[PDB]
Amino acid sequence: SVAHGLAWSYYIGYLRLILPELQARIRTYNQHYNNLLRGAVSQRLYILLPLDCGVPDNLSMADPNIRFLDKLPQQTGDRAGIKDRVYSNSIYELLENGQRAGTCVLEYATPLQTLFAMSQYSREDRLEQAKLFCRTLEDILADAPESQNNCRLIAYQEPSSFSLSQEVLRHLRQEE
Amino acid sequence: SVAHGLAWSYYIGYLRLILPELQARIRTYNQHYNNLLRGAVSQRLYILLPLDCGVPDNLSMADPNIRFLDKLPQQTGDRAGIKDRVYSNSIYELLENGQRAGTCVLEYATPLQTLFAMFSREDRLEQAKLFCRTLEDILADAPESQNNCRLIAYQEPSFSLSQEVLRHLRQEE
Ligand SMILES: O=[P@]1(S)OC[C@H]2O[C@@H]3[C@H](F)[C@@H]2O[P@](=O)(S)OC[C@H]2O[C@H]([C@H](F)[C@@H]2O1)n1cnc2c(ncnc21)NC/C=C/CNc1ncnc2c1ncn23
Numbered sequence: 001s002v003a004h005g006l007a008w009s010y011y012i013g014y015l016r017l018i019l020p021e022l023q024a025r026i027r028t029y030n031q032h033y034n035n036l037l038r039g040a041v042s043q044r045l046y047i048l049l050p051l052d053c054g055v056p057d058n059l060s061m062a063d064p065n066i067r068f069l070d071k072l073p074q075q076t077g078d079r080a081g082i083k084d085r086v087y088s089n090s091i092y093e094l095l096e097n098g099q100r101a102g103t104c105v106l107e108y109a110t111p112l113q114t115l116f117a118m119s120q121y122s123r124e125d126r127l128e129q130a131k132l133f134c135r136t137l138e139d140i141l142a143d144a145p146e147s148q149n150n151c152r153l154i155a156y157q158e159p160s161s162f163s164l165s166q167e168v169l170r171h172l173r174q175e176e
Numbered sequence: 177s178v179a180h181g182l183a184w185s186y187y188i189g190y191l192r193l194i195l196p197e198l199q200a201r202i203r204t205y206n207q208h209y210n211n212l213l214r215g216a217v218s219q220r221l222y223i224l225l226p227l228d229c230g231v232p233d234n235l236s237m238a239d240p241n242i243r244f245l246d247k248l249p250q251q252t253g254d255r256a257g258i259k260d261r262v263y264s265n266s267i268y269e270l271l272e273n274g275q276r277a278g279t280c281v282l283e284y285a286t287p288l289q290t291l292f293a294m295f296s297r298e299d300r301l302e303q304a305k306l307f308c309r310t311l312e313d314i315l316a317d318a319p320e321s322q323n324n325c326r327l328i329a330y331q332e333p334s335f336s337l338s339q340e341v342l343r344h345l346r347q348e349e
Contacts, residue, residue, distance in 0.1 A: 005178030006185060009290040048257065057254045068259060078233040080284035081224065083244060086262040108256035114185040 002118070003129040006111040007136035011144065018075060019045065019146040020089050026105065027073045029091070038069070041091055042104040044175055046168060049137075049155040051130045053116035055108040063167035065095040072105060086168075092173065094165045101165075102172045109133070109153075178294070179303040181311035182287040187318065194251060194263050195221065195320040201248045202281065205267070208286060209246065217267050218280040218345055224337070225311075225329040227304045229292035231284040241271040241338035270338045270345070278345040285311075323348075 026041050035041070059066040068090060075087040094102045112130060119126045134155045141147040154171050198221055206216045235242040244266060252262040268282040289305050308329045315321040326344050 002177070002181035002184075005181040008178075008294060009182060009185070009287060012290045013286060031226045055256050057256065059257045071259060074262075080231050080233065080286040080289060081235040081266060082264060082283050082286075083247060083266045085264060086250075088258060088261060090257060090259045092257075107258050108188060110256040111185060111254060114181065114188050117188045119183060119317070129227075 001129070001132060002114065003132035006114060006138055007133050007140060009108065010111050010137060011140045014087075015045075015141070015151065016144070016146050017077060017079075018089070019148075019150055021075050022089075022105070025075065026047040028073055029070075035070075039093070039100055041072075042102065042172055042175065044104070044150055044152045045089070046104050046106045046152050046154060046171065048106070048108045048164070048168075049130070049134050049153055050108070050112065051127055051134070051155060051157050053112040053126055053130050054158075055110065055113040055116065059090075059092055059164075061108065063164040065085075065163065066106070066168070067093045067095060069093050069103060094169050096165070096169065101169055102170065104172055106168060109137070137172050177303070177306060179291065179306035180310050182290060186285065186287050186307075186311060187314045190263075191221075191315070191325065192318070192320050193253060193255075194265070195322075195324055196241055197251050198265075198281070201265070204249050205246070208221075209249070214245075215276055215279050218287045218348065219325045220280070220324050220348060221265070222282045222326050222328060222344065223281045223339060224282065224284045224341075225304070225308050225327055226288065227286070227301055227329060228286040228297075229300055231286065231289040231292060231333075235266075235268055235282065235337075239337035241336070242282070242341070243269045243271060245279060247267050269323060270340070270342050272342065273306055278340065280345055282341060285307060295315065301316050305340050 022045055026043055028153045029035055029041055056062050070091045072089040076084040079085045085163055092106045102117045115129050141151060152171055156167055202217050202219055232238050246267045248265040252260040255261045265281045269276045273289045291300055315325060328344055330340055
């Protein structure tokens with residue numbers, strides 16, 4: 001199946017490489033006193049898994065209560081003949097009543113965009129593939145030594161009375 | 177199937193985004209970065225598709241006649257909540273009798289590493305062939321593919337990766 005392969009490549013080509021280095025990058029960021037005064041960055045990578053596979057490029061677009069703060073110090077690695085392939089991650093402030101409620105490294109699971117592009121014009125099959133992607137990735141990370149309470153999957157369906165920031169803050173507070 | 181999905185994601189998540197900007201980046205390198213006496217970097221992205229899915233991280237490992245020259249000027253784009261996701265590509269000199277015979281932007285199709293890490297050698301060879309077949313069909317139909325991308329699919333049996341790439345470079349001129 002398509003989703004089986006996308007989930008395994010998402011682990012093998014990304015999460016396997018960055019999760020071992022994530023604690024050290026977030027720690028490096030938090031150890032700068034002027035960063036920490038704004039607020040401590042949470043110690044997990046938060047991965048948004050919208051089951052409708054709607055992956056916008058900007059999080060501020062999806063919810064203005066998700067505000068871009070800064071980038072993590074980037075990780076580099078030689079891979080498949082590309083010298084210094086760069087792994088960049090973005091830090092976001094989550095607003096509640098116009099005030100910062102939390103700070104975290106937050107992004108969409110990009111492979112869902114492939115499932116969406118494959119079937120924008122089948123919505124039932126896309127929902128099945130999205131669920132399979134999440135289920136498979138959950139099983140990989142459950143068994144993987146790189147996943148050590150440093151990664152949180154946030155799977156959701158939109159009901160347009162929805163708060164993405166509240167969904168993230170729900171998960172963020174549970175980990176604290 | 178796995179390879180069908182990997183091929184489509186390789187187009188949608190990479191080739192679709194970088195191939196429209198590749199001519200401008202190679203032109204920028206040839207006009208501003210390339211040393212006065214060095215041969216021009218060729219105008220196409222050369223993608224190595226080893227059917228055994230053996231994808232080393234360094235090209236000098238697979239053949240020492242593939243020498244790293246420089247990196248292209250990097251491309252950035254906001255994507256899936258990551259601000260300024262960076263697309264970096266590496267330029268290689270291909271040596272013949274110790275001297276440069278061509279220069280090109282060269283890399284492996286990284287998704288083959290996923291097929292390798294993942295189902296016997298025979299099944300893996302079938303998935304690699306399906307990956308190549310599917311990617312060929314996508315690029316045949318795609319407006320971003322305008323003679324600016326070259327797929328180099330090969331089976332190793334005494335084999336020269338540099339000669340295989342130089343064969344394709346010479347066909348384009
Ligand atoms: O196994 P791979 S290396 O990655 C799978 C998956 O893992 C995830 C993401 F979700 C991926 O899917 P996608 O974005 S639709 O790309 C599908 C394939 O196209 C190919 C490459 F073959 C991809 O397959 N591809 C994509 N980007 C990219 C690239 N340089 C060269 N080839 C690239 N530079 C930009 C950023 C590179 C590092 N930074 C990353 N940041 C975030 N997520 C990341 C990164 N690298 C991986 N991933």
